[PDB]
Amino acid sequence: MKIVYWSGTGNTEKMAELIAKGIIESGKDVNTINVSDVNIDELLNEDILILGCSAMGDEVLEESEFEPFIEEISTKISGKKVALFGSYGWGDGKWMRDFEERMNGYGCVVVETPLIVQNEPDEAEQDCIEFGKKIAAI
Ligand SMILES: Cc1cc2nc3c(=O)[nH]c(=O)nc-3n(C[C@H](O)[C@H](O)[C@H](O)COP(=O)(O)O)c2cc1C
């Protein structure tokens, strides 16, 4: 499986690692890829797309790298299963509610409730691992 993410301070990156840990514990392999090193062609062969990005700007996806990536794959993911996650700060998840609506609008099936964690996953570490285990059971 593959997990693609963007992280500005490491919060979402740590979530990605924990999610991968859950998938591995369930007995499956998975690679974590920073959005800047993703190969869209290889990624589209995946059964499930696991995507993560922290809340940036005014409750939007990161603009210089992550958003263009989503825009690029948007026309080629109809029917694909997706799992969404990310870290946020002072808001209450607006960027994620919009991210989920967007992916659904592209025809994707959002498999689980998106996982959002405030700042660094501290107390939420097991939650991240469990999210990975849920995706591995798909
Ligand atoms: C420029 C900027 C804008 C942000 N905008 C938001 C926002 O609209 N709402 C929010 O909840 N957090 C916002 N945050 C806080 C980040 O989402 C939060 O610090 C998160 O933990 C960062 O995760 P990362 O290290 O994976 O990027 C913003 C952070 C930065 C640097």
PDB file of all heavy atoms in Angstrom, residues 6-13 54-59 87-91 119, ligand 1:
ATOM      1  N   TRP A   6       1.883  15.546   2.979  1.00  0.00           N
ATOM      2  CA  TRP A   6       2.658  16.782   2.997  1.00  0.00           C
ATOM      3  C   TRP A   6       2.672  17.167   4.488  1.00  0.00           C
ATOM      4  O   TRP A   6       1.643  17.039   5.173  1.00  0.00           O
ATOM      5  CB  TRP A   6       2.006  17.915   2.198  1.00  0.00           C
ATOM      6  CG  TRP A   6       2.890  19.155   2.186  1.00  0.00           C
ATOM      7  CD1 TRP A   6       3.933  19.404   1.330  1.00  0.00           C
ATOM      8  CD2 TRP A   6       2.903  20.227   3.153  1.00  0.00           C
ATOM      9  NE1 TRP A   6       4.600  20.546   1.713  1.00  0.00           N
ATOM     10  CE2 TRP A   6       3.997  21.069   2.825  1.00  0.00           C
ATOM     11  CE3 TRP A   6       2.106  20.553   4.263  1.00  0.00           C
ATOM     12  CZ2 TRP A   6       4.315  22.220   3.575  1.00  0.00           C
ATOM     13  CZ3 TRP A   6       2.425  21.700   5.006  1.00  0.00           C
ATOM     14  CH2 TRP A   6       3.525  22.514   4.654  1.00  0.00           C
ATOM     15  N   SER A   7       3.833  17.574   4.998  1.00  0.00           N
ATOM     16  CA  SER A   7       3.941  18.005   6.390  1.00  0.00           C
ATOM     17  C   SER A   7       4.925  19.171   6.476  1.00  0.00           C
ATOM     18  O   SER A   7       6.030  19.104   5.932  1.00  0.00           O
ATOM     19  CB  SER A   7       4.391  16.846   7.267  1.00  0.00           C
ATOM     20  OG  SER A   7       4.409  17.211   8.642  1.00  0.00           O
ATOM     21  N   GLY A   8       4.532  20.236   7.170  1.00  0.00           N
ATOM     22  CA  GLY A   8       5.379  21.411   7.279  1.00  0.00           C
ATOM     23  C   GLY A   8       6.273  21.438   8.493  1.00  0.00           C
ATOM     24  O   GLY A   8       7.309  22.089   8.464  1.00  0.00           O
ATOM     25  N   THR A   9       5.854  20.798   9.580  1.00  0.00           N
ATOM     26  CA  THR A   9       6.676  20.758  10.793  1.00  0.00           C
ATOM     27  C   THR A   9       6.901  19.321  11.293  1.00  0.00           C
ATOM     28  O   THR A   9       7.631  19.103  12.266  1.00  0.00           O
ATOM     29  CB  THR A   9       6.082  21.627  11.967  1.00  0.00           C
ATOM     30  OG1 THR A   9       4.929  20.990  12.525  1.00  0.00           O
ATOM     31  CG2 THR A   9       5.711  23.029  11.495  1.00  0.00           C
ATOM     32  N   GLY A  10       6.264  18.348  10.648  1.00  0.00           N
ATOM     33  CA  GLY A  10       6.443  16.957  11.043  1.00  0.00           C
ATOM     34  C   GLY A  10       5.246  16.303  11.713  1.00  0.00           C
ATOM     35  O   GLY A  10       5.261  15.096  11.963  1.00  0.00           O
ATOM     36  N   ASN A  11       4.194  17.064  11.977  1.00  0.00           N
ATOM     37  CA  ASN A  11       3.025  16.499  12.649  1.00  0.00           C
ATOM     38  C   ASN A  11       2.291  15.463  11.817  1.00  0.00           C
ATOM     39  O   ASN A  11       2.029  14.350  12.288  1.00  0.00           O
ATOM     40  CB  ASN A  11       2.069  17.600  13.124  1.00  0.00           C
ATOM     41  CG  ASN A  11       2.689  18.469  14.181  1.00  0.00           C
ATOM     42  OD1 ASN A  11       2.255  19.599  14.407  1.00  0.00           O
ATOM     43  ND2 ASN A  11       3.723  17.964  14.825  1.00  0.00           N
ATOM     44  N   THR A  12       1.967  15.828  10.580  1.00  0.00           N
ATOM     45  CA  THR A  12       1.291  14.914   9.662  1.00  0.00           C
ATOM     46  C   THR A  12       2.245  13.785   9.256  1.00  0.00           C
ATOM     47  O   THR A  12       1.811  12.651   9.049  1.00  0.00           O
ATOM     48  CB  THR A  12       0.763  15.664   8.421  1.00  0.00           C
ATOM     49  OG1 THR A  12      -0.140  16.696   8.853  1.00  0.00           O
ATOM     50  CG2 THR A  12       0.009  14.710   7.483  1.00  0.00           C
ATOM     51  N   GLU A  13       3.543  14.082   9.187  1.00  0.00           N
ATOM     52  CA  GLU A  13       4.532  13.061   8.850  1.00  0.00           C
ATOM     53  C   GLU A  13       4.554  11.975   9.920  1.00  0.00           C
ATOM     54  O   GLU A  13       4.611  10.787   9.602  1.00  0.00           O
ATOM     55  CB  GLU A  13       5.919  13.674   8.702  1.00  0.00           C
ATOM     56  CG  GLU A  13       6.998  12.655   8.365  1.00  0.00           C
ATOM     57  CD  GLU A  13       8.366  13.281   8.175  1.00  0.00           C
ATOM     58  OE1 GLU A  13       8.642  14.348   8.767  1.00  0.00           O
ATOM     59  OE2 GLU A  13       9.179  12.693   7.436  1.00  0.00           O
ATOM     60  N   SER A  54      -1.785  18.662   6.435  1.00  0.00           N
ATOM     61  CA  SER A  54      -2.200  19.516   7.541  1.00  0.00           C
ATOM     62  C   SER A  54      -3.055  20.691   7.041  1.00  0.00           C
ATOM     63  O   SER A  54      -3.121  20.961   5.825  1.00  0.00           O
ATOM     64  CB  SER A  54      -0.963  20.049   8.256  1.00  0.00           C
ATOM     65  OG  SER A  54      -0.081  20.647   7.318  1.00  0.00           O
ATOM     66  N   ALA A  55      -3.709  21.377   7.981  1.00  0.00           N
ATOM     67  CA  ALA A  55      -4.551  22.527   7.664  1.00  0.00           C
ATOM     68  C   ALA A  55      -3.668  23.745   7.434  1.00  0.00           C
ATOM     69  O   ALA A  55      -2.894  24.130   8.304  1.00  0.00           O
ATOM     70  CB  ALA A  55      -5.513  22.789   8.796  1.00  0.00           C
ATOM     71  N   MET A  56      -3.751  24.320   6.238  1.00  0.00           N
ATOM     72  CA  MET A  56      -2.946  25.488   5.886  1.00  0.00           C
ATOM     73  C   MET A  56      -3.809  26.649   5.394  1.00  0.00           C
ATOM     74  O   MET A  56      -5.016  26.493   5.199  1.00  0.00           O
ATOM     75  CB  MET A  56      -1.908  25.112   4.824  1.00  0.00           C
ATOM     76  CG  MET A  56      -0.892  24.082   5.294  1.00  0.00           C
ATOM     77  SD  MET A  56       0.057  24.640   6.727  1.00  0.00           S
ATOM     78  CE  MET A  56       1.421  25.412   5.929  1.00  0.00           C
ATOM     79  N   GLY A  57      -3.187  27.810   5.203  1.00  0.00           N
ATOM     80  CA  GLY A  57      -3.906  28.991   4.747  1.00  0.00           C
ATOM     81  C   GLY A  57      -5.149  29.263   5.576  1.00  0.00           C
ATOM     82  O   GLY A  57      -5.098  29.272   6.804  1.00  0.00           O
ATOM     83  N   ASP A  58      -6.267  29.506   4.900  1.00  0.00           N
ATOM     84  CA  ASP A  58      -7.538  29.734   5.576  1.00  0.00           C
ATOM     85  C   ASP A  58      -8.347  28.449   5.432  1.00  0.00           C
ATOM     86  O   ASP A  58      -9.279  28.376   4.627  1.00  0.00           O
ATOM     87  CB  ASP A  58      -8.289  30.923   4.956  1.00  0.00           C
ATOM     88  CG  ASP A  58      -7.753  32.267   5.430  1.00  0.00           C
ATOM     89  OD1 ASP A  58      -7.617  32.450   6.660  1.00  0.00           O
ATOM     90  OD2 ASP A  58      -7.470  33.141   4.582  1.00  0.00           O
ATOM     91  N   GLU A  59      -7.949  27.430   6.191  1.00  0.00           N
ATOM     92  CA  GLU A  59      -8.587  26.114   6.168  1.00  0.00           C
ATOM     93  C   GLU A  59      -8.550  25.494   4.775  1.00  0.00           C
ATOM     94  O   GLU A  59      -9.585  25.073   4.251  1.00  0.00           O
ATOM     95  CB  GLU A  59     -10.044  26.176   6.655  1.00  0.00           C
ATOM     96  CG  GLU A  59     -10.241  26.543   8.121  1.00  0.00           C
ATOM     97  CD  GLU A  59      -9.659  25.529   9.096  1.00  0.00           C
ATOM     98  OE1 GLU A  59      -9.681  24.308   8.821  1.00  0.00           O
ATOM     99  OE2 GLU A  59      -9.200  25.963  10.166  1.00  0.00           O
ATOM    100  N   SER A  87      -3.008  16.748  10.421  1.00  0.00           N
ATOM    101  CA  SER A  87      -2.905  17.475  11.681  1.00  0.00           C
ATOM    102  C   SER A  87      -3.439  18.886  11.465  1.00  0.00           C
ATOM    103  O   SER A  87      -3.374  19.432  10.350  1.00  0.00           O
ATOM    104  CB  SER A  87      -1.439  17.574  12.107  1.00  0.00           C
ATOM    105  OG  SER A  87      -1.321  18.130  13.406  1.00  0.00           O
ATOM    106  N   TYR A  88      -3.943  19.489  12.535  1.00  0.00           N
ATOM    107  CA  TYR A  88      -4.456  20.851  12.454  1.00  0.00           C
ATOM    108  C   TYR A  88      -4.128  21.560  13.756  1.00  0.00           C
ATOM    109  O   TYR A  88      -3.642  20.938  14.706  1.00  0.00           O
ATOM    110  CB  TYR A  88      -5.956  20.870  12.174  1.00  0.00           C
ATOM    111  CG  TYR A  88      -6.798  20.333  13.290  1.00  0.00           C
ATOM    112  CD1 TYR A  88      -7.493  21.194  14.133  1.00  0.00           C
ATOM    113  CD2 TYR A  88      -6.899  18.965  13.507  1.00  0.00           C
ATOM    114  CE1 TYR A  88      -8.269  20.702  15.161  1.00  0.00           C
ATOM    115  CE2 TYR A  88      -7.670  18.463  14.534  1.00  0.00           C
ATOM    116  CZ  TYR A  88      -8.352  19.335  15.358  1.00  0.00           C
ATOM    117  OH  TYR A  88      -9.121  18.845  16.379  1.00  0.00           O
ATOM    118  N   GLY A  89      -4.369  22.863  13.787  1.00  0.00           N
ATOM    119  CA  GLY A  89      -4.043  23.637  14.962  1.00  0.00           C
ATOM    120  C   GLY A  89      -5.225  24.215  15.703  1.00  0.00           C
ATOM    121  O   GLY A  89      -5.846  23.536  16.519  1.00  0.00           O
ATOM    122  N   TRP A  90      -5.578  25.444  15.351  1.00  0.00           N
ATOM    123  CA  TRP A  90      -6.638  26.188  16.024  1.00  0.00           C
ATOM    124  C   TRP A  90      -8.068  26.029  15.533  1.00  0.00           C
ATOM    125  O   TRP A  90      -9.002  26.521  16.176  1.00  0.00           O
ATOM    126  CB  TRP A  90      -6.278  27.668  16.023  1.00  0.00           C
ATOM    127  CG  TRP A  90      -6.007  28.208  14.651  1.00  0.00           C
ATOM    128  CD1 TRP A  90      -6.925  28.658  13.752  1.00  0.00           C
ATOM    129  CD2 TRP A  90      -4.726  28.377  14.035  1.00  0.00           C
ATOM    130  NE1 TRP A  90      -6.295  29.104  12.615  1.00  0.00           N
ATOM    131  CE2 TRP A  90      -4.944  28.947  12.764  1.00  0.00           C
ATOM    132  CE3 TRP A  90      -3.415  28.105  14.433  1.00  0.00           C
ATOM    133  CZ2 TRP A  90      -3.894  29.253  11.886  1.00  0.00           C
ATOM    134  CZ3 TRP A  90      -2.374  28.409  13.558  1.00  0.00           C
ATOM    135  CH2 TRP A  90      -2.623  28.978  12.302  1.00  0.00           C
ATOM    136  N   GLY A  91      -8.250  25.398  14.382  1.00  0.00           N
ATOM    137  CA  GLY A  91      -9.590  25.250  13.847  1.00  0.00           C
ATOM    138  C   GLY A  91     -10.295  24.028  14.393  1.00  0.00           C
ATOM    139  O   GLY A  91      -9.869  23.451  15.396  1.00  0.00           O
ATOM    140  N   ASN A 119      -2.231  19.228  16.436  1.00  0.00           N
ATOM    141  CA  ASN A 119      -0.781  19.315  16.617  1.00  0.00           C
ATOM    142  C   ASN A 119      -0.108  17.941  16.528  1.00  0.00           C
ATOM    143  O   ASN A 119      -0.553  17.100  15.761  1.00  0.00           O
ATOM    144  CB  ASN A 119      -0.456  20.062  17.913  1.00  0.00           C
ATOM    145  CG  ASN A 119      -1.124  21.424  17.965  1.00  0.00           C
ATOM    146  OD1 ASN A 119      -0.919  22.270  17.084  1.00  0.00           O
ATOM    147  ND2 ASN A 119      -1.982  21.620  18.955  1.00  0.00           N
TER     148      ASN A 119
HETATM  149  C1  LIG B   1       0.613  29.237   7.504  1.00  0.00           C
HETATM  150  C2  LIG B   1      -0.189  28.301   8.371  1.00  0.00           C
HETATM  151  C3  LIG B   1      -1.547  28.324   8.338  1.00  0.00           C
HETATM  152  C4  LIG B   1      -2.321  27.472   9.152  1.00  0.00           C
HETATM  153  N1  LIG B   1      -3.677  27.498   9.010  1.00  0.00           N
HETATM  154  C5  LIG B   1      -4.379  26.710   9.785  1.00  0.00           C
HETATM  155  C6  LIG B   1      -5.850  26.757   9.749  1.00  0.00           C
HETATM  156  O1  LIG B   1      -6.513  27.401   8.934  1.00  0.00           O
HETATM  157  N2  LIG B   1      -6.458  25.986  10.700  1.00  0.00           N
HETATM  158  C7  LIG B   1      -5.825  25.136  11.598  1.00  0.00           C
HETATM  159  O2  LIG B   1      -6.494  24.476  12.359  1.00  0.00           O
HETATM  160  N3  LIG B   1      -4.486  25.082  11.615  1.00  0.00           N
HETATM  161  C8  LIG B   1      -3.782  25.793  10.765  1.00  0.00           C
HETATM  162  N4  LIG B   1      -2.432  25.806  10.876  1.00  0.00           N
HETATM  163  C9  LIG B   1      -1.782  24.991  11.899  1.00  0.00           C
HETATM  164  C10 LIG B   1      -1.310  23.650  11.321  1.00  0.00           C
HETATM  165  O3  LIG B   1      -2.350  22.956  10.628  1.00  0.00           O
HETATM  166  C11 LIG B   1      -0.796  22.775  12.462  1.00  0.00           C
HETATM  167  O4  LIG B   1       0.291  23.438  13.100  1.00  0.00           O
HETATM  168  C12 LIG B   1      -0.391  21.330  12.098  1.00  0.00           C
HETATM  169  O5  LIG B   1      -0.033  20.621  13.288  1.00  0.00           O
HETATM  170  C13 LIG B   1       0.821  21.320  11.163  1.00  0.00           C
HETATM  171  O6  LIG B   1       1.149  19.970  10.768  1.00  0.00           O
HETATM  172  P1  LIG B   1       2.393  19.726   9.888  1.00  0.00           P
HETATM  173  O7  LIG B   1       3.587  19.738  10.692  1.00  0.00           O
HETATM  174  O8  LIG B   1       2.097  18.326   9.346  1.00  0.00           O
HETATM  175  O9  LIG B   1       2.343  20.689   8.768  1.00  0.00           O
HETATM  176  C14 LIG B   1      -1.652  26.597  10.049  1.00  0.00           C
HETATM  177  C15 LIG B   1      -0.259  26.586  10.086  1.00  0.00           C
HETATM  178  C16 LIG B   1       0.484  27.405   9.247  1.00  0.00           C
HETATM  179  C17 LIG B   1       1.989  27.339   9.313  1.00  0.00           C
END
